Amino acid sequence: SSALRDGYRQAGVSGRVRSYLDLLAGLSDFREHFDGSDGFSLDLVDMADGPGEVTVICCAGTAAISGPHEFTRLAGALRGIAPVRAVPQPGYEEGEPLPSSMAAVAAVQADAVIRTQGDKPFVVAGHSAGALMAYALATELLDRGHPPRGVVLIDVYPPGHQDAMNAWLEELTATLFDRETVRMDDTRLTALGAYDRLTGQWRPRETGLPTLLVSAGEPMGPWPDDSWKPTWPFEHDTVAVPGDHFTMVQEHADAIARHIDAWLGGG
């Protein structure tokens, strides 16, 4: 077993999550971090080859349970409509190094797709806390010399806005600890507490491309009035979905796949 998986759940039961995070990032100095000068390489995932003239891409967030083991859910719902590429995160499997700073990592997966694609249109579709990174990737892609086609976000909570909700959900992530398709050993945790320091210094920029949210449904509890729901500081158009945070996409992947079919046909 392990030693950290123990404190993970003993924190959520009482209420001392914040103090735990200040501990984690403390160990993020003792490794072999890379930069745009040495050498690295990854190998894409083999998934679907379905029909379509516009393919879609996707990725994962930070919440431990992330991985290329759970998106096979939406894979079946989207088949017939369009293809789906699988871009894995650099680290979740024996034999890998860690980043150096926020605007450094992006010079890696940039070159990889500029070799395999060719001349096909695409779009993005992330989830969870990761809905921040999915936005950041589209920025460097815009002026390098190859603009996207349109993003579709799903539940988010960016910095410089709501100081309450955020850390309030992480407290729940430790209490709601039902099993996942993969075991939680001594590697999938040190990465979670690592991006915490990163996501606290970023602040969005103003761009001009078509956005689309897909909000949730029934609240976790007997919550008061208007004290939730995402609200980005820019401008966009929205569409809902029936469900809740922690699961949604799993047992509700057919729904969203239809909410996107109506979008791509106009804008």
Place this chain on the structure above:
Amino acid sequence: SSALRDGYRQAGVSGRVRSYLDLLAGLSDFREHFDGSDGFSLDLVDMADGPGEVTVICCAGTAAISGPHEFTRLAGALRGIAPVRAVPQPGYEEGEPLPSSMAAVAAVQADAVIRTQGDKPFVVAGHSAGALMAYALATELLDRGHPPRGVVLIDVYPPGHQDAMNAWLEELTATLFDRETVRMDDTRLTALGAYDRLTGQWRPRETGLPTLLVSAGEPMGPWPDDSWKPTWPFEHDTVAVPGDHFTMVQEHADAIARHIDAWLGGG
């Protein structure tokens, strides 16, 4: 194939070990604890019975590779002279919780000492940080109706007195990584930080028990003037034993045996 193994290694090549400990104790605060008002025990590791009048109780260490397993060497040395009742430090092997302070660990280990003993005299002993634990066990027994005949502080390094010396050793241990007797498991490295803050703000008390400090012969390397080796405030006879801070026990057990007898012969 853990992760907390290399993280402890790469920390020695750079030169930062202090801030690495502030966290080890942060993680342990979450594990289940024992302070005196809860069930928990520890079977004294049976070493070798035999002749004698004043058995040597040798408490376990506080390092990563510590435990009553190391005292196997000294156990064979004391065959005929005096037996060894090596007290196991909790938290290191799978399943055992961690204490609150020093008066939480030395207490639980005190119970086992009186139980198996009885009207038979004994002399506690340890090694460096483990000696801080050994003394604490011997002092707690002082006014508790069972003051041991004495102690043998082998290369003990008292905190608050040796700032640069004791800390430079931890920085050396990391670069001394080379095949251990018992695999450096995850639950051992966490217990390190636990005991670090315990023995950290722990200032020993005075007693009328004879102490026999055992220092080293050759330094850990090139040393200018007299500023190495273990020290102590109270009155105690001191005697040296060859090998540096790491091989004065693992590769030099017998040399110490003849030293404690000449001491027990007096009073």
